Amino acid sequence: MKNHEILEKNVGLLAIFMVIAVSIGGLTQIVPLFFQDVTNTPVEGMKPRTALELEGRDIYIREGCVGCHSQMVRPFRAETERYGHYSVAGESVWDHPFLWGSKRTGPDLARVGGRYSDDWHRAHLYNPRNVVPESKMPAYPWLVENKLDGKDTATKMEVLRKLGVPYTDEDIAGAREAVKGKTEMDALVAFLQGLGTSIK
Amino acid sequence: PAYNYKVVRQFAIMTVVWGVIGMGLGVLIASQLVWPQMNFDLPWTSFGRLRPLHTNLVIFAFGGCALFATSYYTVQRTCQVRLFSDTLAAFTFWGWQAVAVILLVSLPLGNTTTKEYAEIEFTGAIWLAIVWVAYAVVFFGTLIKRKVKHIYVGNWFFGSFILTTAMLHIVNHMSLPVSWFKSYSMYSGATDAMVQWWYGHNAVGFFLTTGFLGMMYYFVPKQAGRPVYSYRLSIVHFWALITLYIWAGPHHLHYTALPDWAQSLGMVMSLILLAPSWGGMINGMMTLSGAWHKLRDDPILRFLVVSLAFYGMSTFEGPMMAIKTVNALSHYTDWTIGHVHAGALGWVAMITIGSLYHLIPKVYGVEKMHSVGLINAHFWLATIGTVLYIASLWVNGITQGLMWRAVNEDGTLTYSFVESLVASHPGFIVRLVGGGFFLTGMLLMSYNTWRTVRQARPEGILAAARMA
Amino acid sequence: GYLLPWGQMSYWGAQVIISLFGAIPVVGEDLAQWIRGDFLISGITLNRFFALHVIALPIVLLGLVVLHILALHEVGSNNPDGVDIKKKKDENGVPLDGIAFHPYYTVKDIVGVVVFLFIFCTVIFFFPEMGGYFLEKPNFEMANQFKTPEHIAPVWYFTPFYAILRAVPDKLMGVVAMGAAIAVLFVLPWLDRSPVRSIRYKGWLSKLWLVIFAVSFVILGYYGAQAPSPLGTTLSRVCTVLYFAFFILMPFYTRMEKTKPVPERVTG
Amino acid sequence: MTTFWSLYITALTLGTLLALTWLIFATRKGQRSSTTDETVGHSYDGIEEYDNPLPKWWFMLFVGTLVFAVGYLALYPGLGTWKGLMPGYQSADEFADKEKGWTGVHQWEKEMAKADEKYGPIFAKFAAMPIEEVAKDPQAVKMGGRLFASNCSICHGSDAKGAYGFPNLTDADWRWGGEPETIKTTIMAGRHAAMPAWGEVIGEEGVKNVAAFVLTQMDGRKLPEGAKADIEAGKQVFATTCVACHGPEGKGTPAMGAPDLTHPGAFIYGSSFAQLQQTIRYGRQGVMPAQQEHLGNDKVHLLAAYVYSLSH
Amino acid sequence: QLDHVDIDLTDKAAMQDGARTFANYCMGCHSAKFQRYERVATDLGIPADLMMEKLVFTGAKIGDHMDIGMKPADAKTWFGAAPPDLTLVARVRGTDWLYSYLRSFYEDPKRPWGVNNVIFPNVGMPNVLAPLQGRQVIGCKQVQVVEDGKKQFDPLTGTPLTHEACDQLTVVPKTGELNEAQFDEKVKNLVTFLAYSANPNKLASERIGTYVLLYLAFFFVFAYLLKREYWK
Amino acid sequence: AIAKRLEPVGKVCVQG
Amino acid sequence: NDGVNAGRRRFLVAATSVVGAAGAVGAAVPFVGSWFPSAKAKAAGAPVQ
Ligand SMILES: COC1=C(OC)C(=O)C(C/C=C(\C)CC/C=C(\C)CC/C=C(\C)CC/C=C(\C)CC/C=C(\C)CC/C=C(\C)CC/C=C(/C)CC/C=C(\C)CC/C=C(\C)CCC=C(C)C)=C(C)C1=O
Ligand code: HEC
Ligand code: HEC
Ligand code: HEC
Ligand code: HEC
Ligand code: HEM
């Protein structure tokens, strides 16, 4: 029991032991997730988000909607009835970063694709209380004004392709034109409409 | 010969300053949740943008500066040596302040990685690693240049914290850049979720429990002037805690798309991890054996003891919420936030308050804080304001979980989501009031620290350091 | 040098500045023509100013810098406390508050040079125009002898004196006041009658008047960079009065004030 | 998951558990078995360790957590591809993906089967009667009300009176067909309005005169005092361009979704002179989500009965 | 009141369209004589043969300056004001001024060329982009309603809520090849090319400056260590 | 792509 | 001054000198490079008949 004193007298041995102890846990839960099919095989029928969908997801990231909304429907009957078919690992294979979230200040957005009209997302993302008087969602009446310049769309698509998302040169070339004159609200709504569309 | 108390006192002053700002910003976002009109329809002050700033300032600017202060102070005193290098010691202060300023200037602008506690983007997450390798050098070189034969338990906790929150930082920020402060994670979907939460559960537990457990191990016996309760318990606690906090990560993805074997592993490991955390709490509390009567005279010891009590409460709650049956009720509810602030206001904030109220009148040369009555008032305000926060968020989260899961005998859902929001609104107002109480306590400490910092003559600061 | 680019600002600023020499009551016009080398600003003036700017004034400046540093090293440097460190010397003859310029201040100046180069290269490679103040926008248009810019203003570092000249309604009086604004700094050493050197130990009056002078200089520069305005003109006149009062009243308010005792040893 | 990775998970997890057990058993080895007052010989800045034995209850708690761990990840999916031995579902093949063990999907399928058994008769009963009959059953109409509140109150209003742009399902005016069958079809297949934009067709002046004619002659409200309009020209343009969809009297055509243009209460996009001009100039093209896929024909039938009850 | 334009100097296609517009509609009167066809082709990614065939109309060589046959004195006599060289006009006026100026021409019979400019009143320039924009007049059109900065958009359609204003630039319908958005893009590409011409070293300047600043931070670290040490 | 982008505005119709 | 750390002083002086020399070379690059044939010089020439 006194052998522990050896680590007390040596900084190097203690550092090595701590490194190994912290590494054991991480190497068993993250490494195996790679090379595992269920977490890497996309659901049949999905395609990479369009350039405008990608920019809308980027705006969704910028406005920090992850802290309020979740995109992961758990396999519960109440959950699935409220939101729809439960999310699966194949739906997020091309999501850098994942936006499942851990807090629900508002309804889960995993299946809002096609649930509501574009004209609702607009007039709800411009003044949430206009359509839901008790909403605690912040108003976003600036996504209407500022318009996408398409500066980083090509580079963003190229980087996403480098990370494994199956984009094609026809998409990289056309990304700039796909967001030439469309407002930030348009992209943020188009990305919303595409959520959970692969599974119904 | 003396100690490099310059860096410790800079870190303490900046710890108070950053805690005040972070907690005021937290109160601001809570008010926004109560009244949406507190967003003022400005892009840079909306809840979605400011909330990440709150959660990254309280953890890294307030807690980080506190841990830097209590490590650069505890390591020297327990080793009887000056810090390894004053160069890197001062660099680890100025660069950490630069990191905090980057968080201030960037997160409101929307430059975020969406990773709960890795929101700092490219070229901001690279400087936080440059200034963390320097911190590790400064701490471990000091442990290398010791003038004593052993290494204290608190030193073990601090070193484990430092190494783990460099491995996690480099692993979770492994991304590709599109521009400055614009990045895409290299992990996707379930893999990205697993990496994110294996980093986020160690942003607590190691940044908020291990490093702060070392702060406890030093400042509890020192403040109470009594020996630590058990050496063997300290050994077991340290080793099991560091070997299980990494494992217990998958409990944040309990019923998500993550493979179920990982979820089961996470829950089981968290249930195991219950024991070492309670062992640390037992050591801290029983270190006060024969000295409980000092809680009536010294509010700092009350701070430390109540911090340990809330630590036990949080480390009992957390394993319970790691159970998938319990986690089903509370995974996206306010109960998660209630647990977070039970472990942060009750445990991290209180241990920080007690440790700085002891450290500040030792690196400045002044024998005592300007007003001990202010210390007692701050203790009472923090306690009434953490209890209020805990209770309000518990009620709120249980309500939302039940309402979302509530189903009528017909099979239709009993309640809509807006009904849950309106039912939670009273919880939101009570949370705002408790946060205001805690922020008032923080303001009182800032006034006490300002009045104690002034009236400390040049020599008084100089003699205090004199190595021993 | 600013004439050399031969832009609109170059040409017209040179025109006005050399017309100032036309304000001398008698020989003004002849002197201005002789300086120009032509009946107007032209390529003759351009080549002449180029020769002066490229050789003559660089040589004069190098010689003046040599003389300046030689005089300083003859009398020794001042310090922020105004303490005459030479009064207290050790057994080796070195001042107690003195350190060898090389290497200590050489390395300090190396650090300062690196910081300055960081700012300098940032400006060069990212903001060379500096909002049109380092490179004026109208100067990117070729000089036009027949069209003058809507508003012609000097480079920023000449703007304060310009404001002074613009603050005086009379032309010759304005030129004289602009010249005196620079000439008074020459007599500054005899205007200051304070028993102490550093502002740290001068009386409240000296501190107040230094603040007033700095603010007036900045305001004069700021309002000389824009087209004339009512508030601008009023503040320019007030700041001209204050700028000249900082010097004219120095011999008085340096005596009226009560100064702190200068420490025997430098503080720090 | 591959066999190699299953063995990886199993070996590492069991190694971690064994390491923790060995740590707790070795560190307690040689313990004095009694809280002592003899501190450890060394002092770190005055701090001292009591050298006390591990608390008996704490050690037993750690061992019990270890045992509970082993039991659970033996009973549940863990240690790689080791489906747990839970008797509830470690048998049979009633599940979708032919697996014998716990998962979120597996227990969810069990729960859904139980809930179907419990609730499907209710929906089938209320999904078989005519909408009119279902509309007069408190249980059925309250089910429909809860479905309306949880599914589409956010877009039709909490009380069934929509905000600007969304119809009022409580009033007597119906844009589309107000009959029960038409209501059910509207809730099932969704609706697209397709109101054309006349800004570039009849020009700004024409839009102005029309808007005025609709606002006064049809709606009945007065112009905003101080407005210029050609009411006769507005009527003339209406009789040619607008008369096709909205009836000669501007009373709408439920087949196309054209509303009653003579009532300001039906207008979901506004009734002011400016709002009418906006609608006529830039078109509206309202959208009704198709609620068939989202929640099924039984629930859509219940919702149709509920809205029928509210309106009539 | 100028209109903001977000000009992307890394957009080779936009700069190419702007260069085409400049070579066709602009070099009739305006020179870019401080800028060579060779450098323009190199920076815009235009092959030298393509630049020769498509943008060099004056018989100049690839390395020649973008000179034109119209002499400044002749043009000053003809128009009442000499058309300035446009190589640096983006720096002289800024890109926002150019964007607003090239879209602010409106018919004005009182003027020598029948047009005036909101940005440049009584300008001596004829409206040479009228065929593209179409007839623009100071008339009455729909403008978004604003009350003390309270700008109203349509919550549902996201389009502006408008009221009639009778002192606005209105393009007469079916009078130009390009609609408002297409002419906006044409003018944006032209102003992007002019911005490149005024500052052709911008992108290289940013790259070199980034590397210089990195080196200077490194050197500052070393100099600061050499100072604070050696000052003990 | 560039050639189409750079097409001269003036089009001339030529015999044959 | 008490016990100046030589070697550290020598290392810092040498490293600062080397980095400054690299910066001097970089700052010389514009001046040396501007002496190579410019775009004016590179006009070249066509065959003469
Ligand atoms: C809008 O507008 C405005 C702005 O703008 C935009 C402004 O900014 C401003 C604001 C203005 C400012 C603050 C800017 C201020 C700028 C300035 C100060 C610029 C001023 C510069 C000039 C105009 C230049 C003027 C130059 C002058 C007047 C000096 C002229 C000097 C000469 C010509 C030199 C004479 C040459 C000589 C004597 C030759 C040497 C002779 C010899 C004898 C050589 C030796 C010969 C021999 C040895 C042979 C003989 C032998 C001998 C002697 C025998 C013995 C032998 C021996 C050797 C011993 C204003 C107001 C403004 O509204
Ligand atoms: C990025 C700016 C965001 C987008 C895009 C959306 N949200 Fe939210 N959200 C929040 C609440 C309290 C609600 C209640 C219901 C309501 O307001 O209508 C919502 C709702 C939505 C919905 C509707 C989902 C549905 O099932 O009806 C959508 C499509 C939506 N939000 C998009 C809360 C918050 C929040 C907390 C302050 C933030 C930051 C966001 N929402 C951000 C976004
Ligand atoms: C709960 C699932 C819902 C029921 C039941 C109904 N809706 Fe809606 N709705 C919405 C709009 C914008 C319209 C206008 C359609 C158009 O412009 O042509 C409607 C219309 C209806 C109608 C017909 C009303 C009439 O007067 O004929 C019925 C019977 C109806 N809706 C039933 C908007 C929305 C919407 C926005 C996203 C939601 C989710 C729903 N409605 C949901 C329901
Ligand atoms: C592309 C079609 C063109 C652009 C872009 C510009 N020009 Fe011209 N222009 C012409 C004259 C006679 C003048 C002088 C008018 C006066 O001084 O009052 C101008 C002026 C400009 C300016 C103003 C620059 C300034 O610093 O004020 C700009 C920015 C400009 N032009 C851009 C004549 C002609 C012309 C002869 C028919 C043609 C074909 C063009 N301009 C074409 C363009
Ligand atoms: C069929 C091609 C139509 C013609 C031609 C016109 N209208 Fe119309 N209108 C039509 C539909 C299908 C709708 C429904 C819009 C929706 O989103 O539900 C409408 C609506 C209107 C409205 C306002 C609707 C509201 O406020 O709820 C107005 C004021 C209106 N219509 C008037 C109008 C005029 C003036 C027309 C000629 C210029 C005209 N309509 C033509 C169908 C059609
Ligand atoms: C053994 C100790 C602990 C365990 C097992 C534990 C477990 C958990 C669980 C089950 C959750 C729910 C996450 C979710 O459902 O999304 C959670 C969230 C969290 N708790 Fe703990 N907890 C412990 C102690 C602490 C402490 C001491 C702190 C602070 C000092 C803390 C702060 C947090 C944070 C920051 C989160 C993340 C919130 C989020 O997911 O958005 N926890 N923890």
Ligand code: HEM
């Ligand atoms: C007055 C004191 C505080 C107030 C009012 C406050 C308020 C809040 C609020 C409103 C949220 C978000 C709630 C939600 O999203 O539902 C939050 C989240 C969080 N806070 Fe604070 N906070 C305070 C102190 C602290 C401190 C001191 C810390 C750590 C040292 C901390 C750590 C966190 C964390 C980690 C989260 C993220 C929780 C999650 O994502 O689930 N908080 N806080």
Ligand code: HEM
């Ligand atoms: C323009 C080129 C100039 C150069 C290269 C130069 C150079 C120097 C240097 C190297 C020093 C010693 C270090 C220091 O005190 O900063 C110095 C000191 C000084 N300079 Fe300058 N100088 C210049 C212009 C001026 C001007 C325009 C003035 C005042 C009108 C001036 C007044 C002084 C004074 C009074 C001192 C010594 C004061 C003291 O020791 O604190 N110099 N100069």
Ligand SMILES: [Ca+2]
């Ligand atoms: Ca999250």
Ligand SMILES: [Ca+2]
């Ligand atoms: Ca969260």
Ligand SMILES: [Cu+2]
């Ligand atoms: Cu956790």
